[PDB]
Scaffold this active site. Structure first.
Site, PDB file in Angstrom:
ATOM      1  N   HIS A  97     -18.402 -26.311  22.559  1.00  0.00           N
ATOM      2  CA  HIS A  97     -18.661 -26.796  21.208  1.00  0.00           C
ATOM      3  C   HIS A  97     -19.511 -28.076  21.084  1.00  0.00           C
ATOM      4  O   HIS A  97     -19.908 -28.447  19.969  1.00  0.00           O
ATOM      5  CB  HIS A  97     -17.350 -26.937  20.427  1.00  0.00           C
ATOM      6  CG  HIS A  97     -17.471 -26.564  18.979  1.00  0.00           C
ATOM      7  ND1 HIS A  97     -16.399 -26.141  18.224  1.00  0.00           N
ATOM      8  CD2 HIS A  97     -18.544 -26.552  18.146  1.00  0.00           C
ATOM      9  CE1 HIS A  97     -16.801 -25.882  16.992  1.00  0.00           C
ATOM     10  NE2 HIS A  97     -18.098 -26.130  16.916  1.00  0.00           N
ATOM     11  N   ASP A 120     -11.648 -23.858  13.564  1.00  0.00           N
ATOM     12  CA  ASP A 120     -11.255 -24.400  14.868  1.00  0.00           C
ATOM     13  C   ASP A 120      -9.763 -24.736  14.898  1.00  0.00           C
ATOM     14  O   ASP A 120      -9.175 -25.090  13.873  1.00  0.00           O
ATOM     15  CB  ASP A 120     -12.078 -25.676  15.161  1.00  0.00           C
ATOM     16  CG  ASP A 120     -12.226 -25.975  16.668  1.00  0.00           C
ATOM     17  OD1 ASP A 120     -11.286 -25.722  17.441  1.00  0.00           O
ATOM     18  OD2 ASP A 120     -13.284 -26.492  17.081  1.00  0.00           O
ATOM     19  N   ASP A 124     -12.168 -31.813  16.805  1.00  0.00           N
ATOM     20  CA  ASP A 124     -13.375 -32.142  17.569  1.00  0.00           C
ATOM     21  C   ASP A 124     -14.014 -33.453  17.089  1.00  0.00           C
ATOM     22  O   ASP A 124     -15.247 -33.626  17.107  1.00  0.00           O
ATOM     23  CB  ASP A 124     -14.386 -30.982  17.516  1.00  0.00           C
ATOM     24  CG  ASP A 124     -13.872 -29.709  18.198  1.00  0.00           C
ATOM     25  OD1 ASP A 124     -12.715 -29.708  18.669  1.00  0.00           O
ATOM     26  OD2 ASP A 124     -14.630 -28.704  18.266  1.00  0.00           O
ATOM     27  N   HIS A 137     -17.085 -31.805  24.173  1.00  0.00           N
ATOM     28  CA  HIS A 137     -16.809 -30.707  23.233  1.00  0.00           C
ATOM     29  C   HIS A 137     -15.677 -31.041  22.249  1.00  0.00           C
ATOM     30  O   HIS A 137     -15.494 -30.357  21.239  1.00  0.00           O
ATOM     31  CB  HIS A 137     -16.612 -29.352  23.941  1.00  0.00           C
ATOM     32  CG  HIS A 137     -15.268 -29.178  24.575  1.00  0.00           C
ATOM     33  ND1 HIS A 137     -14.687 -27.940  24.745  1.00  0.00           N
ATOM     34  CD2 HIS A 137     -14.386 -30.078  25.070  1.00  0.00           C
ATOM     35  CE1 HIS A 137     -13.510 -28.086  25.327  1.00  0.00           C
ATOM     36  NE2 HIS A 137     -13.303 -29.374  25.531  1.00  0.00           N
ATOM     37  N   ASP A 228     -15.370 -22.022  16.204  1.00  0.00           N
ATOM     38  CA  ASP A 228     -14.806 -22.044  17.556  1.00  0.00           C
ATOM     39  C   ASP A 228     -13.884 -20.843  17.683  1.00  0.00           C
ATOM     40  O   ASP A 228     -12.969 -20.676  16.876  1.00  0.00           O
ATOM     41  CB  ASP A 228     -14.024 -23.332  17.759  1.00  0.00           C
ATOM     42  CG  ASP A 228     -13.525 -23.516  19.185  1.00  0.00           C
ATOM     43  OD1 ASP A 228     -13.201 -22.518  19.871  1.00  0.00           O
ATOM     44  OD2 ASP A 228     -13.493 -24.689  19.625  1.00  0.00           O
ATOM     45  N   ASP A 230     -11.513 -20.293  19.474  1.00  0.00           N
ATOM     46  CA  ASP A 230     -10.100 -20.649  19.618  1.00  0.00           C
ATOM     47  C   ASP A 230      -9.378 -20.900  18.288  1.00  0.00           C
ATOM     48  O   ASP A 230      -8.204 -21.213  18.273  1.00  0.00           O
ATOM     49  CB  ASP A 230      -9.859 -21.766  20.659  1.00  0.00           C
ATOM     50  CG  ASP A 230     -10.272 -23.163  20.187  1.00  0.00           C
ATOM     51  OD1 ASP A 230     -10.398 -23.423  18.978  1.00  0.00           O
ATOM     52  OD2 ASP A 230     -10.476 -24.032  21.068  1.00  0.00           O
ATOM     53  N   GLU A 273     -17.344 -21.317  22.584  1.00  0.00           N
ATOM     54  CA  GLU A 273     -16.136 -21.402  23.415  1.00  0.00           C
ATOM     55  C   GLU A 273     -15.584 -20.075  23.941  1.00  0.00           C
ATOM     56  O   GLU A 273     -14.497 -20.031  24.537  1.00  0.00           O
ATOM     57  CB  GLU A 273     -15.038 -22.247  22.749  1.00  0.00           C
ATOM     58  CG  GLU A 273     -15.443 -23.692  22.498  1.00  0.00           C
ATOM     59  CD  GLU A 273     -15.434 -24.537  23.766  1.00  0.00           C
ATOM     60  OE1 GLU A 273     -15.080 -24.015  24.843  1.00  0.00           O
ATOM     61  OE2 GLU A 273     -15.802 -25.724  23.695  1.00  0.00           O
TER      62      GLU A 273
END
Ligand SMILES: N[C@@](CCCC[B-](O)(O)O)(C(=O)O)C1CCN(Cc2ccc(Cl)cc2)CC1
Ligand SMILES: N[C@@](CCCC[B-](O)(O)O)(C(=O)O)C1CCN(Cc2ccc(Cl)cc2)CC1
Ligand SMILES: N[C@@](CCCC[B-](O)(O)O)(C(=O)O)C1CCN(Cc2ccc(Cl)cc2)CC1
Ligand SMILES: [Mn+2]
Ligand SMILES: [Mn+2]
Ligand SMILES: [Mn+2]
Ligand SMILES: [Mn+2]
Ligand SMILES: [Mn+2]
Ligand SMILES: [Mn+2]
Lengths: 306, 306, 306
Positions: A97, A120, A124, A137, A228, A230, A273
């Protein structure tokens, strides 16, 4: 409607090997055909090769690969800036990221009133002074937000970066793993977010309504979707470096992307990611890359009703 | 801030071997560190050793281990009462759900105006006259509810129990496997519950709102959270004796625990029915125990937003 | 109350072998006992043997097994009609979804104001002129809707069919895989549906409320529930021919069935497209058949609260 596809095989924003194979895995999952089928005119820039930096030692004995991440993002920004100016909506495939530093900077160069939807598990938004990992990231937003620059020191390879965005111009969706200094930052600057908890309460429909009301309620703005993988529950997207239980469902992820498309304003999308090497099997790797394609396609108009 | 941890390796409330290893599994999943990090001052009472009872024959040719369950609960009530009187919030790790007879009795010894939130796939409100299994873990509420006593015969080992908790003082969340005589009892005594169906309709936010209105809408009361791990869907908590499809999601469970914490009134918590031996793999066992730690930690202040 | 159970092993409405074993798998998963337990008086018609048609060549070089599907549906329709006229609620076990041509025709024969709830990932409303597969299981609704009849050509074996449903009398729930010509048809004839997207927005409770409003908001009508197992997410119903990710959850499926039961108007039910041979394991096959039994049982009154 033209779409540019850029592979950004970044791995130096973090420490786990393999995320640089994310773009290939997403391509192999059939991205290009899916986009063509929706009627997108496509330009494939391929996978960029970023210029390495010799002797890229730790910054302040903690921050890893600062010059490499800096230069790769400078080069990426240039390509992104060019593609937008040629009228392409920009799809960048990651990679970790930290490349959002590059895509957002490039996007904002000529579209300074852009807004950001950051999907996300994580904020971040650590700075070099708050990060406990040293992994860039987990810091990209801190380099981009105007109100934070007095608290973000200058890293080698980062001097070209001009923070391009106000803290009222980013909204987070899906946050469930937030460091205490990031929580402080979000509250201190009144940065708007919808955590998994907010989704549990409001439902994904109201979350999108309120997201768009905050960002484009008063004026039309080009949208940057930084997604992202995740954000999704690890059962759906296991092939990723920092999975956190209790994520978005498949339907929630599609709904987000659908609403992004419905604004008519999507101007750039990061899909980051995906790390095929972290899957325990190739089915797990493929299911993750397949999910990535579903998000991108949905973001450019694929529907669940034909 | 002070939290007491009590291991109660109860298995005689039911017939399946291994639930007595529940407390060790939860500890090995890192419970104490998680509680410590939240700022809990901890007293670990360790795992209790309960006094055996010789010749503990079936009661009425059905009810198994009545004196053992009675005496173990008497001994557990003594430990809980002492910990609560010294200012500890009391976390009891099971062990089968018959130990709630002990923890709730012991808790009420100090705090007689307590209320109970019972999170479970089951109502656990069979009496010795209605149980079809004879397993005391499916009866504990019947010994505790004041309105039911004249329909509840006296079991050997149970005479120390003075059930002082009103039927308006318990709310169930998650019910999907209810025996017909239990359904009768719930309706006849106007005991409030939110079944999985109610959660489907209202959503977990409104369920918690309504739960607290019923229990603490008029005044502040210490809350006893009795959490059966089988409230969660079998996909999330496989290591348990009576799994039932269609349970709480991970997010729903966290949300319940978060709202419990947000009242500021949590005084005691049971986490029961984790049976590591019923897992098909060490992974299924560990995921169940990790989930138990997540519930407990969330109930004492862990958030999904940092 | 009386329930007739009819096994319809058909598999010529599509191309994948094994769906003809759907009825035995559902029976083996305990259907009859579950129905008995609810108080259903049962008539078991067993599994029908449909009369084969020799030299049943492709229609228009595309449509597979037309006379076989035509004749089997005629024979099924007769059995359904007879059972309904003799006072039975009719459960038909499939078998592929082309048999809905038969169950709905038979049902409508003596209950002409019937309405249809079609629970499915798919619209099943291609005509012989729009199908890209030639598989009749993806066309049954087109033969049943009055408004479509001048655009549906006459297939060999289909002449006995008299369209018995107006487009305002069918509601879909669960749609996520819709062919463009079907989408055109749905909008063009103003056929009401709740896609997975609508469920994401409204929730299943509101979907059912509005479903019944549309169908029985002005008058009581016998309800025909045609439930394709593939409406469920593939993780829950893997043993089926055309799985599509992002389907109904278990709880949502039960909620639908409970609401069907709660109208008091259920007159016939299809449970189709269970194909045990498509499971990667015996476990996957049994869980799919068990889910099928759960829907049917809930549709006739099984609750999640006792
Ligand atoms: N906040 C993070 C995670 C960033 C993830 C970046 B992304 O882009 O995938 O959102 C950061 O590195 O700044 C971490 C900060 C703290 N660590 C905690 C931790 C580190 C290592 C281990 Cl072994 C166990 C726990 C994990 C999260
Ligand atoms: N209601 C129960 C289960 C209660 C579980 C207690 B807990 O603490 O885990 O909530 C009881 O024993 O009272 C049972 C009563 C009825 N039986 C039915 C049954 C028994 C055995 C079998 Cl093999 C299949 C079904 C299972 C549930
Ligand atoms: N709409 C369908 C599927 C209907 C399924 C019927 B049911 O009863 O299971 O709802 C039809 O045959 O009309 C198909 C139409 C289009 N095809 C697309 C396709 C076909 C083959 C392959 Cl290998 C990949 C994609 C699959 C779905
Ligand atoms: Mn992340
Ligand atoms: Mn990220
Ligand atoms: Mn239980
Ligand atoms: Mn219980
Ligand atoms: Mn179908
Ligand atoms: Mn279907």
């Amino acid at each position: 409607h033209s779409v540019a596809v850029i592979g950004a095989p970044f791995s130096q924003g973090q420490k786990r090997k393999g995320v640089e194979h994310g773009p290939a895995a997403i391509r192999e999952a059939g991205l290009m055909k899916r986009l063509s089928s929706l009627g997108c005119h496509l330009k494939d820039f391929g996978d960029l090769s970023f210029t390495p930096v010799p002797k890229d030692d730790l910054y302040n004995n903690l921050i890893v690969n600062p010059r490499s991440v800096g230069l790769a993002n400078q080069e990426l920004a240039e390509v992104v800036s060019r593609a937008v100016s040629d009228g392409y909506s920009c799809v960048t495939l990651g990679g970790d990221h930290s490349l959002a530093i590059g895509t957002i900077s490039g996007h904002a160069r000529h579209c300074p009133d852009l807004c950001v939807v950051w999907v996300d598990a994580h904020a971040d938004i650590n700075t070099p002074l708050t990060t406990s990992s040293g992994n860039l990231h987990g810091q990209p937003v801190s380099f981009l937000l105007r109100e934070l620059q007095d608290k973000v020191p200058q890293l080698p390879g980062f001097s070209w970066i001009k923070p391009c965005i106000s803290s009222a111009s980013i909204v987070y969706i899906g946050l469930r793993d937030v460091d205490p200094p990031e929580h402080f930052i979000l509250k201190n600057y009144d940065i708007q977010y919808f955590s998994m908890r907010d989704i549990d309460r409001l439902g994904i429909q109201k979350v999108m309504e309120r997201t768009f009301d905050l960002l484009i309620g008063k004026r039309q703005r080009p949208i940057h979707l930084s997604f992202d993988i995740d954000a999704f529950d690890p059962t759906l997207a296991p092939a990723t470096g920092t999975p956190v239980v209790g994520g978005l469902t498949y339907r929630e992820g599609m709904y987000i992307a659908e609403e992004i498309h419905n604004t008519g304003l999507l101007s750039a999308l990061d899909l980051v990611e995906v790390n095929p090497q972290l899957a325990t099997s190739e089915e797990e790797a493929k299911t993750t890359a397949n999910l990535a394609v579903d998000v991108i396609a949905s973001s450019f108009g694929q529907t669940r009703e034909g």
